[PDB]
Design a protein around this nucleic acid. Structure first.
Ligand SMILES: Nc1nc2c(ncn2[C@H]2C[C@H](O)[C@@H](COP(=O)(O)NP(=O)(O)OP(=O)(O)O)O2)c(=O)[nH]1
Ligand SMILES: [Mg+2]
Ligand SMILES: [Mg+2]
Length: 430
DNA sequence: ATAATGACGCT
DNA sequence: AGCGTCAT
């Protein structure tokens, strides 16, 4: 009864920018606003690979990782902006700084955890408490939740989206128990109000629009965020879960999108998140290991404990480049040359990092791919990073991989390299 | 010829 | 330490 722990202890939100790279490009170039458009890296191979798509472009079937030439076939009026190129490669600096604008704004409200270049989680538990004290005990008005959806409402005894949304919101507020300061749903509601505010501020001060999820944990906040994108936020209450999970494919839950999620489907013979409830913890631990079992057992009940880590800053800093097919690096002059290109970008990102964030990386990781290998990395090797010098860093990276050169000739490089990757890690205060 | 990255688990 | 998985 009262000792069944229910995962309602926290209030956690996930804010993710809408078609981010696109909005960055549209803020810069007014011509691209409210039009089908996409952002590509490179231009020579089939017009370039798409990495971001406005919603007007999505409505014609344009997706991430489509070639730009194929995309034009679906959507001939498609507008494109391409990623800056420096030192012979894609440079993402404009989106990193645009990201920092967003993160700095979110930081104002609460401690965030940077989960990607375009999203952060927030623990709103404390701020909800505060706002709750300050609102005395007066009703919460719909005018404070102008973009909020209540997952699973309306239900019970208009045909347009705004109509439906409001009915849902009304039902929820009409049944909200305001006098009870310890009510989880009331807390979510208040969290949701703050998130409206946070989103108003982001758009006011950056001109960028975003979606958000408000729930009791990260997994649910993330899932909820996706439900009503673009430019809308979504409250997933603890009670909405059984219905939500009842037809939620397992693959849609964070960290279940790959192999583990496949074996869950496969071993258990299920499709949806909620069918997990029929398994005892021990059983799921038997199949999926002890951590996964535990995590799965609670997750399918909407309970998840991972905390919102106070980390606004990346722990690693990295430059990488693929050299597909024919362009696979095949001489020792080439490998050196790109090591230097990568090294030089890395150097300028680190000097900026050290000035901005009062810290130095202490270690360099070197990673490569050989032709005829299947995985992201063929090989990783660490060395010291003692100076922010592109020559030393490039020289040293070379040093630690030269032995991988299987070639008999002096100058040649075999097998040819299909990837080079440098990553600075192990940071210490500066 | 998706491509550039970032986080984290396992051993 | 170096590899594997999952994500955006
Ligand atoms: N370079 C590179 N960037 C990528 C890749 N995948 C995503 N991004 C970049 C480009 C993305 O703009 C940014 C954030 O990605 P999301 O939030 O996953 N999708 P978005 O915000 O575009 O649209 P929405 O969220 O509304 O559906 O990360 C990639 O494979 N490579
Ligand atoms: Mg996004
Ligand atoms: Mg995202």
């Amino acid at each position: 009864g009262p000792h069944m722990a229910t995962g309602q202890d926290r209030v956690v939100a996930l804010v993710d920018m809408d078609c981010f790279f696109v909005q960055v490009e549209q803020r810069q170039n007014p011509h691209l606003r409210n039009k089908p458009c996409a952002v590509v890296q490179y231009k020579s191979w089939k017009g370039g690979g798409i990495i971001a798509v406005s919603y007007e472009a999505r409505a014609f079937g344009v997706t991430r990782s489509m070639w730009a030439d194929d995309a034009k076939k679906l959507c001939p009026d498609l507008l494109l902006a391409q990623v800056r190129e420096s030192r012979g490669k894609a440079n993402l600096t404009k989106y990193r700084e645009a990201s920092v604008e967003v993160m700095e704004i979110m930081s104002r409200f609460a401690v965030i955890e940077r989960a990607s270049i375009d999203e952060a989680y927030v623990d709103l538990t404390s701020a909800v408490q505060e706002r709750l004290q300050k609102l005395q005990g007066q009703p919460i008005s719909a005018d404070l939740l102008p973009s909020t959806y209540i997952e699973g409402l309306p239900q019970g005894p208009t045909v347009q989206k705004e109509g439906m949304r409001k009915q849902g919101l009304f039902q929820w507020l009409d049944s909200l128990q305001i006098d009870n300061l310890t009510s989880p749903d009331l807390q979510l509601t208040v969290g949701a109000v703050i998130v409206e505010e946070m989103r108003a501020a982001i758009e006011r001060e950056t001109g960028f629009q975003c979606s958000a999820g408000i729930s009791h944990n990260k997994v649910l906040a993330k899932l909820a965020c996706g439900l009503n994108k673009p430019n809308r936020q979504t409250l997933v209450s603890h009670g909405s879960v059984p219905q939500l999970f009842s037809q939620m494919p397992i693959r849609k839950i964070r960290s279940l999108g790959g192999k583990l999620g496949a074996s869950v489907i496969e071993i258990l013979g299920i499709e949806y998140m909620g069918e997990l409830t029929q398994f005892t913890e021990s059983q799921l631990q038997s199949h999926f290991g002890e951590k996964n079992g535990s995590w799965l057992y609670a997750m399918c009940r909407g309970i998840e404990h991972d905390p919102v880590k106070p980390r606004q800053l990346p722990k690693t800093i990295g430059c990488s480049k693929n050299f597909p097919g024919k362009t696979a690096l095949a001489t020792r002059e080439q490998v050196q040359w790109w090591l230097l290109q990568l090294a030089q970008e890395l150097e300028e990102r680190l000097t900026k990092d050290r000035n901005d964030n009062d810290r130095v990386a202490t270690q360099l990781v070197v990673s490569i791919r050989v032709q005829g290998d299947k995985r992201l990395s063929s090989l990783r090797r660490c060395c010291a990073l003692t100076r922010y010098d592109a020559h030393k860093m490039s020289h040293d990276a070379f040093t630690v991989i030269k032995n991988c050169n299987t070639s008999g000739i002096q100058t040649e490089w075999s097998p040819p390299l299909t990837m080079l990757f440098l990553c600075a890690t192990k940071f210490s205060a500066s």
